[PDB]
């Protein structure tokens with residue numbers, strides 16, 4: 001039921017907010033814009049670590065583009081939905097801008113829990129507990145708590161950052177429940193690991209300490225259970241599909257364009273792989289009148305994004321009933337007519353950009369930096385009577401369980417930028 | 432008896448030197464001035480490590496100021512003492528300048544055994560043997576020798592530096608016995624640890640290898656025993672109180688002034704905490720005519736130092752008999768009327784200067800530097816057949832017991848400046 005999916009509740013509320021008596025979905029955008037976690041995204045790795053103030057993307061600019069594309073997708077889908085179910089507007093009072101606001105707010109914050117150095121950073125944080133110092137804690141934690149530690153993802157960290165309670169400020173940013181539902185793409189815990197081939201089962205979305213919180217949200221939105229066991233799991237919110245589609249479109253095209261502009265990909269491929277996407281709307285005279293690679297690739301990027309957005313809207317509207325029922329098992333991008341072109345673009349990006357020498361060098365350095373910082377924090381946690389551990393506490397982190405302390409350490413390491421992490425690493429070693 | 436406390440003996444002497452047949456107490460000043468250990472004090476930490484050639488103090492300038500204040504205190508106390516005991520001048524032949532010379536010489540060398548990076552350096556050297564590599568030696572040493580290693584202080588190292596025998600030069604600097612007595616403030620060994628609440632029992636003053644030497648000195652000056660056990664301990668030399676008073680006055684006031692000049696303390700506090708000390712002699716017109724913070728704080732510092740010096744002289748002359756008997760249990764500064772102001776100044780200095788971010792960064796770096804250098808020296812000591820250990824010996828240290836070798840390693844690390852230690856650390860790691 002769509003009347004329960006578009007909820008306006010906030011954490012710690014007793015009177016039900018109504019749409020007629022209102023806007024809630026724009027304050028979420030404003031609150032995310034003005035927060036420190038969002039501001040820390042300006043110097044976090046998207047693909048190339050330590051961007052050197054070049055023209056390449058960071059996490060912040062990527063999130064902004066995903067937000068624009070998400071607003072467009074949400075507006076179109078909301079128009080079609082309001083056409084399909086008239087009573088959503090004539091009784092409850094929902095307009096087609098609310099869907100755009102929800103998807104834009106969710107897409108702006110979709111990537112906020114990521115640590116420095118990107119995917120390699122998450123792998124390093126996991127390997128620290130798996131085959132490093134943190135291994136010593138294995139006997140002192142529940143299997144669900146250990147699987148949280150050794151398979152750390154930014155998806156759970158983002159939910160925690162968004163919904164963190166502190167003395168005097170309950171609920172953290174206190175976003176609406178619809179935004180939280182559209183933000184979550186893996187509504188399950190860390191065990192069991194990969195129970196099936198469903199798209200919503202690749203990873204997990206919340207930690208144990210936050211688990212209870214999500215239950216509340218999942219009760220309010222009327223999500224559909226899938227547990228059939230002692231481990232909880234729910235079905236996806238329908239707008240989470242749109243969030244994922246926007247994320248995928250943006251990074252797939254922009255990575256290719258950035259690699260072309262950097263000199264790692266020849267310009268010819270730009271027309272070898274993209275023409276079928278842009279052939280139906282390209283103006284040949286305008287394309288031929290341009291005189292630099294940047295203009296041509298920008299033109300192609302704009303046309304491709306438009307085409308993919310339209311196709312994604314059509315695909316979503318086709319399989320709406322299955323998504324509402326919970327039986328859909330793929331993403332909207334896998335039901336597309338240009339899957340071969342996307343696959344070729346991704347494979348070329350993997351061969352040329354992800355495995356380039358400079359990228360590998362930066363990832364190797366990031367492994368060492370993260371391991372050193374985590375080991376210092378953990379050793380200061382174990383013994384708190386020495387002078388050195390007091391100094392470490394004063395520099396890095398100015399009544400809890402062991403699991404809560406370890407989660408706090410992981411969270412505090414992941415709020416740093418690449419530059420701050422490198423500077424602290426050099427300071428620890430006195431260089 | 433004061434005739435035995437003002438002794439002119441030197442190490443390796445058989446004919447008793449007499450005051451009538453003389454000056455001995457000034458050659459000590461000259462010999463300390465011209466020695467390499469005194470010259471190494473120019474680049475050693477007082478409060479802020481790696482001073483960056485700023486206006487802040489180092490160990491050398493601090494020692495010079497302590498020497499000036501000590502000369503003043505000694506001159507005043509010697510005048511009053513010669514007034515009290517006439518026979519000290521009419522028979523033996525002691526003038527009021529001898530006390531000033533003794534206190535000045537002792538105060539100039541009071542701080543010569545300190546390692547690089549200050550207090551954090553001593554803590555690092557101790558922690559290396561406590562919870563580091565050096566722990567392996569615990570089973571091979573006597574409990575008194577291990578407590579020397581794990582509670583390393585600069586007070587014992589200074590005595591060793593002053594009285595070190597080498598082939599062709601016995602006695603080291605060969606200072607007079609009165610100067611050595613006034614230099615020592617903790618005449619006891621490293622065990623037992625803190626037997627009481629006496630001021631002279633907080634730490635220890637000599638190592639085991641030097642123990643016999645001090646006994647000789649303690650026999651010549653007629654110090655009073657306090658052992659009542661198998662572990663030796665004596666009472667303090669009376670002029671050691673004056674040395675300690677001068678040290679305390681100087682660092683307490685100058686730390687505050689330096690923090691004000693650096694921008695870490697607001698100027699208002701300068702008059703909130705100091706007025707009662709300077710209110711009885713301050714000229715208001717001169718204070719108001721000045722136009723910079725530096726001039727005002729310098730004026731206040733001068734007035735405060737004068738007031739505290741006078742009060743300390745009065746306090747010493749009040750409790751003279753108890754100090755001579757050995758029953759005095761506090762310092763001269765705790766019997767003062769401005770204890771609350773001193774306590775407030777010290778607490779503000781701890782909150783603002785000792786715990787500032789830059790200071791913590793430098794201390795954290797110093798821990799790593801000292802640990803690396805000590806581990807290299809110890810590993811070269813254990814195995815001496817490898818090529819690498821021969822290289823280490825040639826770079827760092829171009830028939831003894833294990834304890835003597837470990838003490839020598841600790842001494843050789845503590846003669847380095849901060850810059851030399853950092854340069855050697857970088858060279859070891861090839862950066």
Ligand SMILES: Nc1nc2c(ncn2[C@H]2C[C@H](O)[C@@H](COP(=O)(O)OP(=O)(O)OP(=O)(O)O)O2)c(=O)[nH]1
Nearest residue numbers: 046047048111118119120155203247251255354359
């Ligand atoms: N350097 C580097 N970048 C990578 C690698 N794998 C993926 N990336 C980049 C490509 C994209 O810019 C970005 C994709 O991360 P996102 O968090 O936006 O989504 P992703 O689909 O990777 O995962 P998620 O939805 O969070 O489970 O990461 C890799 O192995 N190395």
Ligand SMILES: Nc1nc2c(ncn2[C@H]2C[C@H](O)[C@@H](COP(=O)(O)OP(=O)(O)OP(=O)(O)O)O2)c(=O)[nH]1
Nearest residue numbers: 477478479542549550551586634678682686785790
């Ligand atoms: N950075 C830093 N400086 C400190 C700390 N504690 C004391 N200091 C500084 C303040 C003074 O400038 C200086 C005092 O050392 P001294 O060797 O002159 O005498 P202290 O009374 O500390 O000890 P002592 O008579 O040697 O047992 O050390 C600390 O925790 N951090």
Ligand SMILES: [Mg+2]
Nearest residue numbers: 110111114154
């Ligand atoms: Mg992500």
Ligand SMILES: [Mg+2]
Nearest residue numbers: 185244247248
């Ligand atoms: Mg994804």
Ligand SMILES: [Mg+2]
Nearest residue numbers: 062066111247
């Ligand atoms: Mg993204």
Ligand SMILES: [Mg+2]
Nearest residue numbers: 541542545585
């Ligand atoms: Mg000292």
Ligand SMILES: [Mg+2]
Nearest residue numbers: 616675678679
């Ligand atoms: Mg002291």
Ligand SMILES: [Mg+2]
Nearest residue numbers: 493497542678
């Ligand atoms: Mg001193």
